[PDB]
């Protein structure tokens, strides 16, 4: 499933006050149960990277965010291997759990989709 598609559905829910008040609280509870924040991770650090879109995206990420993602990932592996969680004061806070890689991913999917469209454009005379 593409991020363009997840964004389409997600944004539609976020705009409509009917769904927005019904779902978000469910989603918030789902995120806390997930537990990734207790390992010091941000959701975007969890995205499977072994594909061209994600490689293009990670390549375009500014240095500072890149070194940060690296530390968070290494810290998560070390904590996982010790069968512990990080001290609560080190957990990622909701304010910090921002979709930092999302804009780069969406941009790459659009560029990719346009190429696919242009390589297959039909012509009518």
């Amino acid at each position: 499933q593409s991020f363009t598609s997840i964004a389409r559905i997600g944004d539609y829910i976020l705009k409509s006050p009917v769904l927005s008040k019904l779902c978000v609280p469910v989603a918030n509870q789902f995120i806390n149960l997930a537990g990734y924040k207790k390992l010091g991770l941000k959701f975007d650090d969890l995205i499977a990277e072994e594909n061209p879109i994600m490689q293009t995206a990670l390549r375009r990420l500014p240095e500072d965010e890149s070194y940060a993602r690296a530390y968070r990932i290494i810290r998560a592996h070390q904590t996982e291997l010790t069968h512990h969680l990080l001290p609560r004061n080190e957990w990622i806070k909701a304010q910090e759990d921002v979709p930092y890689l999302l804009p780069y991913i969406l941009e790459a999917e659009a560029a990719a989709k346009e190429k696919d469209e242009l390589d297959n454009i039909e012509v009518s005379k």
Binding site: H77, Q78, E80, L81
Partner: protein, 55 residues
Amino acid sequence: MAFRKSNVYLSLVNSYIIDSPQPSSINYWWNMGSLLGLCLVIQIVTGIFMAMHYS
């Protein structure tokens, strides 16, 4: 370079069993594969020795 790396046969052993880079966090669930190779060996060895007496 080290002999385990230069020799044609040993380098296979080295790249698969000695220097093979493993993710630091794999847990005991990742031990099943070696257990399967071991099982394969136990079945083959015991079967050949029994075949010697089977009709």
